[PDB]
Write a protein that binds this ligand. Structure first.
Ligand SMILES: Nc1ncnc2c1ncn2[C@@H]1O[C@H](COP(=O)(O)OP(=O)(O)O)[C@@H](O)[C@H]1O
Ligand SMILES: Nc1ncnc2c1ncn2[C@@H]1O[C@H](COP(=O)(O)OP(=O)(O)O)[C@@H](O)[C@H]1O
Ligand SMILES: [Mg+2]
Ligand SMILES: [Mg+2]
Ligand SMILES: [Mg+2]
Ligand SMILES: [Mg+2]
Lengths: 603, 601
């Protein structure tokens, strides 16, 4: 049948649609049940996630290809943002495949690159029935709630399934259970595949003059702030394998889920929330934000240490992150200007990824962009306006707060008298929180915002905390963006392969490993102390956050490659991977001024 | 200024509007799905202020003065219940910023009373914000409407109003600290006695007093004849104070019940006590999360007399009696009552229309009833409310008319797609169809999406993922008696709760108790046992094999020859009327009569 024709249903009344597109017949492809994303119409993964969500209220994280599901080790229980264990069993297992189980195909043969996923609906003595999308594209017999049956051989308590295809490879099945018996250990990637490698373009003088296009306003805003410069030596770049990017993608999606799970735990317990030093008057507002804008985050940036020892996350800049322009535009132009290879810039789709996120946000039609008066934020703010524009929103850029004012009744208006009720900001929420802390000893029954002023002087907090102004990033993002969340994540996922032991005191293990001291609300590599296991100060930075509470994180130094310490960063857009970029510095501490290093992912 | 004009803001950006009506669904004020109040009354501003600044809310109330009697606030994000204390004007407990300030009815605030929010406390005064006093723009950036003089003598705080004929009750603080606070008012028993009365017999009910021209009234007659009770010239009355109490209890108990529901759905150990097929558990949860605010109507059963008010159960899934209370008794009154009282259920049909208007029902609603003439008028009465709220409907009687197309889509007798249903069926009937199979290890609710002879079962409709069903699946939890011991556990000794347990514990042995199947209804399989350990009564029924709960004995009062039970309706979570049920026996049943009731001030 044509694309999206209803073919029948799997157990429980879960539809099965034809996913046959033809050359003869982009946001419309996103399949959602409420605010929960099921996948892409009407692929194998979309059916499997929807089946699991409609029948058991659970879902698995975003994956590029179906075969990757087999590498996952948990499922998110949607109604309470809970995390359940998911075990994997290889085909030919003592662990029989029960109804409800995920059945995964590695890539290969009939499922060439994608691999495949289906749901086991019923087990028999010598076969199982399964349901799936993207195999059967014709209507199923009336009332039949399975698409295919696969023969199952049961020898000596071992179970083996055989496909109806002759060139495919069945990885195995998956069960949501705490019972690890017979299960496969979580796949671990070979260190060597994570090594970052230096490389060099041929010098044909490609970066001699004005290589950035000064006709493009965005690029020129970038030059006004930085010159025709990305890194020290533009002829030099670094590369990472595709296996490595795949690993980056996987960790980004998983850690985003871990962080929102620890955010939920935080907001559910005053003792945990207290650890963040956020003004108590905001607490109920933080809870309400989390409840109603749960799915409204547009973008954030994770900072990682990646090399042969593995993948580790230092932090998640979820409130207000930048580098998007550098990764998604300047490096594109850099590649266009001088890269002649087969590889690619892992951040190439960032602008479109952002546009999609905005299309599916609940942002108002007109969005005011609030940036500070720093030429450096100009391009960041304009790069985002480009995504907003592409998604169909109207915008106006506010530089500083001077243009903002109030009518007689106190409504917030811009320099043109237009009402400001939706803003995307470059300002960190914490900056506004400082305005409440300044008058901490006053007895306000509410966030002390102004609804009027003789001189019409509008402060940041007078915009961001007006109840009817719809702000992005949402207020709750200050929680995953606050390093006080690291000890909590370590407590929730002790010894997780991507986490570093982090604590509020230098505990015993940190003593022996050496640690990094970081302010909980700092950024840009400010006020950071790196202390060795030999108890010597390896490095230290200055900055405005010296008075804040600090956390202590197990020392795990950036690798040094081709003379520079290299840090890997990934972007999240709507909660999922949206790209990777590199920061390189002569020291162990990346900072606001550290270079962005051209990165090419090679297959 | 004209109605709804912004006059400014109270602290934190909570707008204050003009409520000058001088200058019907449009008056409801909501923030998302949370109902704030009526535009733009004192109560609406107080509730919106507390919700926007602290994410908490207080229960619906008829007039502002009643807030002073409340002792809890609901925390919206986790449906948690926080303690709220009351302090009398002239208290050692100072009125802090954020506190609710309540006026009793009287003077400037004649019937309503009033409520404001205290924004700032000084040494000789307090500043407050409110909505139904000042209707003119406020001084630019001023986030308070009036200032009241505060007198402070010997550790005691006293506020004086700007009006000379008003009575300030006090202020309320969300705190566990009970020192200085007021005990929760309790009504005088005498005001709760139900009294009998008689109309003068001038033959008002001799013949056809019900209008058979009205299809609804005729559906009622086809099922019951021109009859309501054994003697139509007799009636009962309750005081307006008793009604205010029933209102208060209905709203509180509905929130307590939803609170226990949230707790149940958060803990498998509690959920398991309900004997609901495990396969539905994930669905119950999704339903509770997505259809939180979608319950249309329910009915609580109470014992009310000089000893006070006790709730037996809350028929939150499939409740009836709406036609009797809201139409037939109205006709009864119009036909034979000439007094000053009123039918407390008179506005039921309008209350339901509103609930529907703000539900998220789809454009076309299929009404599903069973083939029982008794259900015809209930279905039809509800259809009228749906019609009034602008919805298209079709009544399906039994399952015969339903079918499936070739792909397995559910359709009605005219090929129309069925995707929104209001049912008279109890969810339990459907759960039975799941229990019947129970052998196989199905991976999902075992619904059919096709059948050779096209035979559609109740579950094949209600548990179809894309059919939007009212009442929502989650209501089976407050409607299942296994929630009574949980309610007792959560609010131990609450004034309206009866000690309920899953075994006859020691305290129940001493009090006597009622044995009640957890998923029964209509008075079936009930056993009443006295403290003397004697069976005071037993009923038969189709539920003898279910788990039972044991509830502290508290027998209905007998007035004028019959045990009288008081019921109240909830519509959209709030009080929507009262009616009476009378029986020669201690156990009310489906056939027990509905007794005319008049509320008198
Ligand atoms: N545990 C750690 N071990 C080694 N270096 C660290 C560690 N944590 C942070 N760093 C270094 O410090 C920089 C700043 O820490 P980060 O967590 O990214 O905070 P921010 O960038 O917000 O200031 C990192 O980019 C990295 O170079
Ligand atoms: N604890 C109790 N003490 C005395 N009578 C009770 C008690 N519980 C129930 N009854 C009587 O039994 C009837 C049926 O119980 P109820 O809880 O309303 O269950 P249902 O109506 O669902 O069968 C009540 O209307 C009342 O007449
Ligand atoms: Mg960083
Ligand atoms: Mg940071
Ligand atoms: Mg009852
Ligand atoms: Mg009942």
């Amino acid at each position: 049948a044509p694309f999206g024709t209803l073919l029948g249903y799997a157990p429980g009344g879960v539809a099965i649609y034809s996913s046959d597109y033809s050359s003869l017949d982009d946001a419309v492809f996103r399949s959602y049940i409420d605010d929960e994303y099921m996948g892409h119409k009407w692929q194998c993964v979309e059916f499997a996630r929807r089946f699991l969500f409609l029948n058991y209220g659970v879902v698995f994280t975003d994956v590029g290809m179906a075969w990757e599901i087999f590498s996952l080790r948990f499922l998110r229980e949607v109604v309470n943002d809970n995390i359940l264990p998911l075990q994997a069993f290889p085909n030919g297992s003592p662990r029989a495949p029960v109804a409800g189980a995920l059945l995964i195909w590695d890539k290969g043969g009939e499922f060439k690159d994608t691999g495949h996923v289906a749901i086991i609906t019923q087990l028999h003595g010598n076969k199982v029935r399964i349901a799936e999308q993207n195999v059967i594209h014709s209507p199923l017999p009336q009332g039949q709630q399975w698409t295919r049956e696969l023969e199952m051989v049961v020898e000596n308590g071992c179970y083996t399934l055989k496909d109806t295809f002759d060139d495919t490879t069945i990885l195995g099945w998956m069960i949501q259970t705490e019972d690890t018996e017979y299960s496969l250990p979580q796949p671990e990637i070979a260190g060597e595949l994570l090594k970052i490698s230096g490389a060099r373009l041929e010098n044909k003088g490609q970066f001699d003059g004005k290589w950035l296009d000064e006709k493009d306003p965005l690029q020129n805003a970038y030059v006004q702030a930085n010159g025709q410069v990305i890194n020290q030596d533009p002829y030099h770049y670094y590369t990472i394998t595709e296996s490595a990017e795949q690993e980056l993608i996987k960790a980004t999606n998983e850690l985003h889920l871990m962080y929102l799970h620890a955010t939920d735990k935080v907001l559910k317990d005053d003792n945990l929330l207290a650890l963040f030093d956020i003004p108590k008057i905001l607490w109920p507002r933080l809870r309400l934000s989390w409840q109603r804008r749960r799915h409204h985050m547009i973008t954030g940036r994770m900072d990682f240490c990646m090399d042969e020892r593995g993948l580790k996350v230092y932090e998640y800049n979820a409130d207000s992150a930048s580098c998007h322009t550098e990764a998604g535009l300047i490096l594109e132009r850099w590649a266009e200007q001088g890269y002649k290879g087969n590889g690619f810039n892992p951040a190439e789709g960032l602008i479109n990824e952002l546009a999609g996120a905005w299309k599916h946000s609940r942002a108002r039609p007109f969005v005011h962009i609030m940036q500070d008066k720093d030429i450096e934020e100009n391009y960041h703010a304009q790069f985002m306006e480009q995504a907003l524009h592409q998604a169909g929103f109207e915008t106006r850029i506010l530089r500083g707060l001077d243009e903002l004012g109030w009518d007689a009744a106190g409504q917030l208006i811009d320099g043109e008298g237009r009402l400001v009720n939706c803003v995307w900001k470059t300002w960190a929420w914490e900056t506004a929180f400082d305005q409440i802390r300044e008058v901490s000893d006053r007895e306000f029954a509410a966030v002390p915002i102004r609804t009027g002023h003789p001189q019409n002087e509008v402060r940041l907090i007078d915009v961001l905390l007006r109840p009817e102004v719809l702000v992005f990033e949402p207020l709750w993002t200050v929680i995953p963006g606050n390093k006080a969340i690291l000890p909590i994540l370590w407590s929730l996922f002790p010894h997780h392969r991507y986490l570093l032991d982090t604590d509020f005191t230098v505990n015993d293990e940190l003593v022996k490993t050496g640690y990094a001291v970081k302010p909980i609300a700092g950024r840009c590599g400010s006020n950071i102390d790196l202390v060795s296991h030999h108890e010597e100060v390896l490095d230290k930075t200055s900055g405005k956050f010296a008075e804040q509470k600090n956390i202590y994180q197990q020392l795990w130094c950036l690798p040094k490659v081709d003379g520079k310490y290299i840090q890997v960063c990934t972007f999240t857009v709507g909660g999922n991977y949206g790209g990777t970029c590199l920061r390189g510095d002569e020291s162990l501490v990346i900072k606001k001024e550290s270079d962005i290093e051209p990165l090419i992912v090679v297959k």
